[PDB]
Amino acid sequence: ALMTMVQALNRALDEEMAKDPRVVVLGEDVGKRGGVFLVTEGLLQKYGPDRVMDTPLSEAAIVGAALGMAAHGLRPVAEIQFADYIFPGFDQLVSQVAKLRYRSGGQFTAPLVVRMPSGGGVRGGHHHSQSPEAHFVHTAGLKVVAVSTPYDAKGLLKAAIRDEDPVVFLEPKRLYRSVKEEVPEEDYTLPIGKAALRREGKDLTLICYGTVMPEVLQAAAELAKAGVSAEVLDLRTLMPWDYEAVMNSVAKTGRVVLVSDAPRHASFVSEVAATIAEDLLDMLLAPPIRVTGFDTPYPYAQDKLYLPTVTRILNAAKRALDY
Amino acid sequence: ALMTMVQALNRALDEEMAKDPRVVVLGEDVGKRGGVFLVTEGLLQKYGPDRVMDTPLSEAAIVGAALGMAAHGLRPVAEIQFADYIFPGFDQLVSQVAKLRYRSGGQFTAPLVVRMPSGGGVRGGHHHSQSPEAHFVHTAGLKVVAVSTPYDAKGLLKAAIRDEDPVVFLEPKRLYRSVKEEVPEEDYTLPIGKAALRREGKDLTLICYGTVMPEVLQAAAELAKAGVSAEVLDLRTLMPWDYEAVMNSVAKTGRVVLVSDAPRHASFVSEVAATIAEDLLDMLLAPPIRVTGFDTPYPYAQDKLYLPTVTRILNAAKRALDY
Amino acid sequence: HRFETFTEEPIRLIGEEGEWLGDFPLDLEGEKLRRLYRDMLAARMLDERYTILIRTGKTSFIAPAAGHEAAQVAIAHAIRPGFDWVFPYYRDHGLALALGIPLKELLGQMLATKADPNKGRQMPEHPGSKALNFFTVASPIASHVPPAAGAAISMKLLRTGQVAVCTFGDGATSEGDWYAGINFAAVQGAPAVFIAENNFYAISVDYRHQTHSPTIADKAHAFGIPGYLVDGMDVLASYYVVKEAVERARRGEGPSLVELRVYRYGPHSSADDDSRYRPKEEVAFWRKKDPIPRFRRFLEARGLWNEEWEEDVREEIRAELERGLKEAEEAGPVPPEWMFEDVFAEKPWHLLRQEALLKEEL
Amino acid sequence: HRFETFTEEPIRLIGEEGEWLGDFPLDLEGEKLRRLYRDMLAARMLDERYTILIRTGKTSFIAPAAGHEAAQVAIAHAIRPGFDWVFPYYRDHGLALALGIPLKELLGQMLATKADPNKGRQMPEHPGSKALNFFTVASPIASHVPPAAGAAISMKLLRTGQVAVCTFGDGATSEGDWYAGINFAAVQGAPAVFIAENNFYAISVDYRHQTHSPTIADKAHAFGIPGYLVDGMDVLASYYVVKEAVERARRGEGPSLVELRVYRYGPHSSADDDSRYRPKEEVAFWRKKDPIPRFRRFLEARGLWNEEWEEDVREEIRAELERGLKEAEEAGPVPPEWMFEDVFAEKPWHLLRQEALLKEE
Ligand SMILES: Cc1ncc(C[n+]2csc(CCOP(=O)(O)OP(=O)(O)O)c2C)c(N)n1
Ligand SMILES: Cc1ncc(C[n+]2csc(CCOP(=O)(O)OP(=O)(O)O)c2C)c(N)n1
């Protein structure tokens, strides 16, 4: 049956919690309220306060406690109300969570998940729109996943919960209820570290993920009207990203445009772009072009313009095509 | 006069403080102790506890209070004992400092400087070796400077103190007393945002900064002996970086190798590399090659293997030259 | 005079019958007392106007402050607007109004028009004014606490004689930066007053699940500074206790932590739903504690209030609101280009390139 | 019997002349009392062996714990090693030793040899042991407090009957994460005991410039939990108070904050210069409070110590140190490739590539 991303995420949580008593949920307003976006709705009622717990208003406490719980015996799925608010608990994330296995020679592990809504397209201003994935990708020891469809949301969240490595799970808030897709109720997982081919093409490769998918997909549609077949590749996992899928697509088309709503400088798409250039220069028929968020804090008034538009993506595609 | 980087930095602070009563220094152990690296030695005795203040052990307090002081009327130079410890005060840096001017429509400003020792090569393990500049460059609103010579240290720190925009000033600790260079006693500043050509050449461009300079210059010297003329460009300012200086060199040589000890993924050099590929594809005779720190936490035992070696840099140069 | 610290019972000055309970004489002239009342009505009416702005789609977000009037107006009058500094949070629009910030600017920010001196950079409920030293609201909870401490340290070092007041809710007291900032201010004996507008909830998380200390005032023990528990629905108790803390700071005796117990009558925000976690029984109990009718009785018992004046004040306020909204709206939308302004004092090469890029699309 | 919370004067049980000052009768057998002394001597001698390792260049960094022996040894004995969890910081090698961690592993980590179960990944003074639930030391001050709270919450939810003890210095109490972590543990009524080894200094910054609360114990009021002020140079006072807090935690009554007042006799670290910010009058005043001679006098008055036993114990420890160091060194250097292991459970494509790149070197 069809369901939104919120429902798929809720289902994934419900399913894993029923399967493993060790799986617990913690964060601000996740219990009684069921989450500010209702992702954890009904879980407290079904599993109890010792499985779903509202925490004090401290991201350091949430992330850090989750790390301790994971190291001792639980499988915590912590929630940071908005990706923008991970910073108060940033040291816990980069100094404790990310480095635990490494610094302890593998003696201690962190089987935990930190999920958080992210991205703009919802007029969130400075702290209700950020996409901080670059900060996580840059930190060795953290797996990073950003979903864009209900089907992936359920499959990848279940995979993250089963994965023993710490996973930062980003959920583009604009996509929480933007569409109802078929999501099997049957138990299934999706592979972390693997991209998903949304549309096959041979004239242009469109590398993207999360928040910008709607515009990227419509841009490909517009291009199709002009006889241009764009291959759309949703990376899904940002760390470790699907090196092979990316290079295979770029080798085929010879031209690539990478899209994300995260700020340009030292962004994840910049990493992929630099890697394509370093490894596939000989296959490039045009320069790798990046369409990203601007290097400014996220603006409220110009929210509509900060987030890459179909036009902005198309202009970059034309540039790559006419090169 | 001839002096070490520590002396050059100390002189810069002394001078700016003698020139402007608003300039104050704050941080852990900066007072009586004179700093764990002696950068603030003698300042307390000369200017008093109300201008050189030891603070409680809190990076959020240091950075946040510094932000408050700057907004009100002082010109603080905050010190984070090790760049590795900026994280506990990360939200203050990226949410309050970086966005103050923007979020207030310019009503409030942050004329503050955040100094911090950084870089590996000193057997500092996980937290006495990090180079987190990427985190800062990715944050809109922060100027980022990383010096590598005593001359630049004094000139750019003085410049930062005079700059009204928030500046994160990184000082590669392995270079604190590694050499004694001529540093004018007279007052002088250097331009933030301008690279420095260390060596002119036409066969290869070596883009680098901070920590890795010793090995890069050494590699350049060795290439010379082999008949290879490499151009060495010390960026100095990472944000905003010298776009023109970079493109002019690469356009001329046609081949570039970027070096840094910071982790590869979503690093600052990855940003520069991606930009070169995007804007100068037509001028590239070889792929942009990046020699960076590995995507692992900084290891203690393998300290000298993690930091880019002359050999590592030379191997990259050979790949670029033989391509 | 010195109020008692860490009292088990919140400090009150207004008897339920309108009697004065102070252990010192009331020294506020009738004119000043009526002004406190006037500002509370204005704050309440602004809040009710906000509800309408949400309905009519004029603003996309509001944080109901109804129930916080006594606390917010008291704070605004305990300091010197334009001289002392204020580090508020999103629910302080009543304080902003009482402080003197033009409705045009407050509403301009709510509507993101050019009337907003903050240039529509953030979402609604993020006012800020250079003129009145109202540090622009930031979204991360308690992130403004360390800066407040810093501003106060600057005031001390520069000998300006100013004080910095910092307001926050109960949830904010759980953040590490809240603790870290106040600790530094205390160690430096900085002129900062930290005030909690405790409504017993952080969206849906109640006080009991927020912290284990019986009160927020008790936390002051962790800094070695005085802590006060006050009836935040009592405008006089709030005014005098905060004022005393302000004077203490001004004379160089260091910071204080003042807990003003109030109640949030409306939901957490327009994006929330109050009746989704609070017993209508608790809401009703606190509804009988509305600070407005309570102070009205106090003024009435002193010949300082009558129905005619009441109606006169309300009509003047609604006219100010209408005029304020009109000015804010006629200001016009903020230009798209402004998105690249104020990141730095001047736009660097990359921002100029990005601005040119956007223009291709406009 | 219980102990008074938030006392004016720090709790003490050992008199100046070695007499027992407790209200209750001493209930520790002579054999256990001798063990406490033995472990303090071992800790002190380990600290002195570390000083030598620096001089010979065998290790690049040490954090002198001389002066903290009573506190650290008391903590090791107040919990159940191998059952309860410990979240220590860099200066707790005395606690690690008394807890039972093999000298081979401690020295292996100091020398970064394969004897280090932590694989020489961090600089010296970063021990960690899975077997003894000794959560590997992390450098950022107080960063281990929230994790400690989390493990305690897990112990509670899983009803393991375990307790988590978390140690830190006075400077650590100024960090936001310290406060945030304890606050959450308190709200959850988690079985965690937070213990401050207060030596009145955070490198060069003194207590007065660290916090304005007269004591660290007073900070407990911010969490609504019991706070105790203890004479950390008194191994018995430290043992009993920490023990009481641990039992309270174990029976489900929530966390406590115990302040153990001690003194750091050596410099902050081998990279520090003590004699540059501390008065000789203060240092002299505290050297006269060394916990070792103090407990020695207590034992002697009870016939539990004699000069001959002291000689024998010291010889035993001396030999244990040499044997441990030998085993640590004999383990050999950690392989260069280990630098790419344990970042994740398995090496992703980028680390495999980076490993291969290094091999060429
Ligand atoms: C660091 C951070 N985490 C989470 C949020 C989301 N959030 C916004 S308001 C709020 C409630 C805070 O409550 P309280 O401080 O009691 O203030 P009140 O709204 O009750 O007056 C939360 C959790 C945020 N803005 N910042
Ligand atoms: C977040 C952070 N900031 C700074 C440092 C550098 N530093 C290392 S030890 C230390 C002193 C801490 O003192 P205290 O907690 O009192 O412990 P002690 O060394 O006195 O036992 C400091 C500031 C650090 N490790 N982490």
Ligand SMILES: [Mg+2]
């Ligand atoms: Mg509240």
Ligand SMILES: [Mg+2]
């Ligand atoms: Mg200390």
